[PDB]
């Protein structure tokens, strides 16, 4: 039924939205089945779990891997080696480090900046004013491609609160784009299994769906 859930979900998305199939807590065989249904973008929250899966998927030539979880400095080199996108960039120090590493490795990861717009004790994220302050410095990084913002809803929001959070993410990104015209801030990484339709309606370009596609762990 992975193939059926994928087709059902894709039929609903406009061309502007790409789906990331979030395979965290599912094995390589799940990913293989999604791929046979035409899925190419997969998301993981742990670097080592993705490294292991990648070693079991040598049959898949054209995967794009997205890192969705908190990235500490001790996994930064592996992150840059093994992921195409890193959505969870939540600080200047991390951004600067990824940029130096990417230089040394000859890679150019595509990054989203993970921004905290509402209180959430479960997730890290940039303070909006801290992010406005660092934009000149982020603008000058040469070895990463900063492409957008990532926003994750605090647990237990209502539909209406979620809808307003995603709208706020859209408007904040536009404000940053105006303040940093060097940045190609074209993306909004938002929406998961329960709220992706709200995210799409407010301008998401990447949605991140796990459970609705793969079922539970």
Ligand X SMILES: *Cc1c(COP(=O)(O)O)cnc(C)c1O
Write out the residues near ligand X by the rule CB under 6 A: 22, 24, 45, 68, 152, 192-194, 208-211
Residues near 93 by beta carbon (within 8 Å), at least 6 away in sequence: 73
Report in angstroms how near the CB of residue 123 gets to ligand X at its nearest: 8
Report in angstroms how near the CB of residue 142 gets to ligand X at its nearest: 27
Report in angstroms how near the CB of residue 99 gets to ligand X at its nearest: 22
Shorter beta-carbon distance to ligand X: residue 70 or 132: 70
Residue, CB closest to ligand X: 210
Compute how many other C-beta atoms are within 10 angstroms of the C-beta atom of residue 167: 14
61 is in an annotated binding site: yes
DSSP SS3 for 85 = strand
25 is in an annotated binding site: no
Smallest Cα–Cα separation from 167: which of 180, 185, 194, 149? Answer: 149
203 is in an annotated binding site: no
208 is in an annotated binding site: yes
Smallest Cα–Cα separation from 167: which of 208, 199, 205? Answer: 199
The rounded distance, in Å, linking the Cα atoms of 207 and 47 is 20
How far is CA 124 from its chain centroid?
14
Report in angstroms how near the CB of residue 200 gets to ligand X at its nearest: 14
Q: Cite the annotated binding site by residue number.
A: 45, 61, 193, 208, 210-211
Q: Cite the annotated binding site for Ca(2+) by residue number.
A: 61
């Amino acid at each position: 039924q992975i193939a059926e859930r994928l087709a059902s979900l894709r039929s609903q998305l406009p061309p502007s939205v790409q789906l990331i199939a979030v395979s965290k807590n599912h094995p390589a065989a799940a990913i293989r089945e999604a791929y046979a249904a035409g899925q190419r973008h997969f998301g993981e929250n742990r670097v080592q779990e993705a490294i292991a899966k990648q070693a079991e998927l040598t049959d898949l030539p054209d995967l794009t891997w997205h890192l969705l979880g908190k990235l500490q400095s001790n996994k930064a080199r592996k992150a840059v080696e093994h992921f195409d996108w890193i959505h969870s960039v939540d600080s200047w120090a991390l951004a600067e480090r990824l940029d130096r590493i990417a230089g040394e490795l000859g890679r150019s990861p595509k990054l989203c900046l993970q921004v905290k717009l509402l209180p959430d004790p479960n997730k890290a994220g940039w303070d909006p004013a801290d992010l406005r302050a660092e934009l000149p410095q982020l603008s000058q990084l040469q070895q990463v491609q900063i492409r957008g913002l990532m926003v994750i809803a605090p647990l237990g929001l209502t539909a209406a609160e979620t809808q307003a959070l995603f709208a706020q993410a859209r408007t904040f990104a536009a404000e940053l784009q105006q303040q940093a015209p060097q940045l190609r801030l074209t993306e909004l990484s938002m929406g998961m299994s329960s709220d992706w339709p709200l995210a799409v309606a407010e301008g998401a370009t990447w949605i991140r769906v796990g459970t609705q596609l793969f079922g539970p762990r």
